Amino acid sequence: PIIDQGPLPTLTDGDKKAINKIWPKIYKEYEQYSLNILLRFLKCFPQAQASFPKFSTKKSNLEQDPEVKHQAVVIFNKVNEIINSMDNQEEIIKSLKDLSQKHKTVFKVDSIWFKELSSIFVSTIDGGAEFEKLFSIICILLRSAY
Numbered sequence: 001p002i003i004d005q006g007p008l009p010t011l012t013d014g015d016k017k018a019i020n021k022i023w024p025k026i027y028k029e030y031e032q033y034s035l036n037i038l039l040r041f042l043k044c045f046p047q048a049q050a051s052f053p054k055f056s057t058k059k060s061n062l063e064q065d066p067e068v069k070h071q072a073v074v075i076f077n078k079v080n081e082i083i084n085s086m087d088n089q090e091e092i093i094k095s096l097k098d099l100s101q102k103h104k105t106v107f108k109v110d111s112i113w114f115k116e117l118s119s120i121f122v123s124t125i126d127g128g129a130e131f132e133k134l135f136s137i138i139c140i141l142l143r144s145a146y
């Protein structure tokens with residue numbers, strides 16, 4: 001499944017091929033997708049809500065929260081940008097290695113959260129083993145500054 005520790009996995013030509021088949025259908029509605037992913041994460045993991053100073057209101061207005069939607073799309077886009085550069089595995093490493101640093105020293109986020117949001121991301125878009133490896137690479141790197 002999704003992993004967040006250990007030797008970085010390598011994306012096969014096959015994995016990359018499969019991912020690029022499912023992806024467009026997803027970003028064809030990145031707004032309705034990015035939202036459900038973030039909303040299901042906060043509903044099933046309410047304790048994670050305290051990590052976003054940008055918001056901490058009553059969950060009754062959490063789907064209209066403009067800032068909620070803004071963070072939703074921010075995540076979806078990074079994932080998109082990582083898929084756009086799957087071939088150059090040196091670029092991905094450099095990029096996500098630095099983002100891990102922001103989350104640690106700047107946003108003061110707990111590393112145990114990435115895998116969980118990642119689990120919901122995949123399930124919502126229905127990605128297979130391919131996407132689990134992608135997010136395995138994503139989560140391992142996001143926890144590298146820790």
Ligand code: HEM
Nearest residue numbers: 048051052053054074075078079102107109113114117118
């Ligand atoms: C799939 C994994 C994730 C990706 C791809 C991702 C990506 C990003 C990106 C692109 C930013 C923008 C940073 C900047 O502008 O310099 C960000 C900020 C942030 N992320 Fe994540 N993130 C992920 C998971 C999480 C999780 C699980 C949490 C914690 C519950 C988290 C908490 C934050 C916070 C609090 C900020 C600061 C937002 C702000 O104040 O504007 N992230 N993230």
